[PDB]
Point group: C3
């Protein structure tokens, strides 16, 4: 399970860490789930373009996060848009939020299985 | 939709932008439609290897482009290959082009 | 086919090359087949978090590698965990290995078809 922010906007490490921490709090809160083993990341891609433009843009991708459905997906997308427009000064119209569920298509192993 | 160029070859930002612009143009021209919602990117990955070698290499992944069919995909791969060998001096054999098929919200709904 | 090490652990280029080559050897060894077409990468993502912590963490994602299956994927994940905890000193519990097979999903072309 991953929440990745892929963006051409540059922000310092402490603020990035705070931004992801806020998003993780939002997923937990809106979804009503503990997310004890979520991965997240701020992937700075300076050359990223959207619609032919290298202007500020944030793509957020949520993969295999259990518990997203009609009653909450938009609510989660709204809150992540707010956080980013707040912290990053990106236009909301240059935020795009995608949810995908790959849980059943992949095999996953923790290193803790092997000693 | 996404066209990502993942490569261990470094070029300046403005040349990367030009290069992605030309790839977007080729996608639009060869698929015969606008690329209004396309994301594209030049992801410099200095340690990228292919076939056991860290020599110059470009992997292009196109995800969820509409119109993708047996009759246009090869010309589009060809055109992308020419653009990269031109702009990056990558050997053709060290270019690999993948087409992949894949709930979304624009932040405009909320702002 | 791709094996990507996505990690907040910082290592020099030579050590990244050596580590990826060892992972390639493990895949080829376990599969009993050549890894000639494989891409591998060390993707330094300094802001990467796992379980609310930016502490040393490695996520290895293997995509569309033919011949990896239920009978050997645990064996390969065990070997990769050992290689990374050796080279990167990451805790095995902050190693996570994911296998996805998309091998029949999408079209692919070598640029050698068109130039060379």
């Amino acid at each position: 399970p991953c929440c990745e922010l892929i963006t051409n906007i540059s922000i310092p490490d402490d603020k990035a860490q705070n931004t992801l921490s806020e998003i993780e709090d939002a997923i937990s809160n809106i979804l009503g789930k503990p997310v004890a083993y979520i991965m997240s990341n701020y992937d700075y891609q300076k050359n990223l373009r959207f619609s032919g433009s290298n202007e500020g843009y944030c793509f957020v991708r949520l993969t295999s996060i259990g518990g997203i459905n009609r009653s909450n997906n938009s609510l989660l997308a709204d809150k992540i848009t707010k956080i980013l427009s707040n912290h990053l000064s990106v236009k909301p119209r240059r935020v795009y939020i995608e949810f995908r569920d790959c849980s059943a298509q992949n095999f996953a192993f923790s290193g803790s299985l092997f000693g």
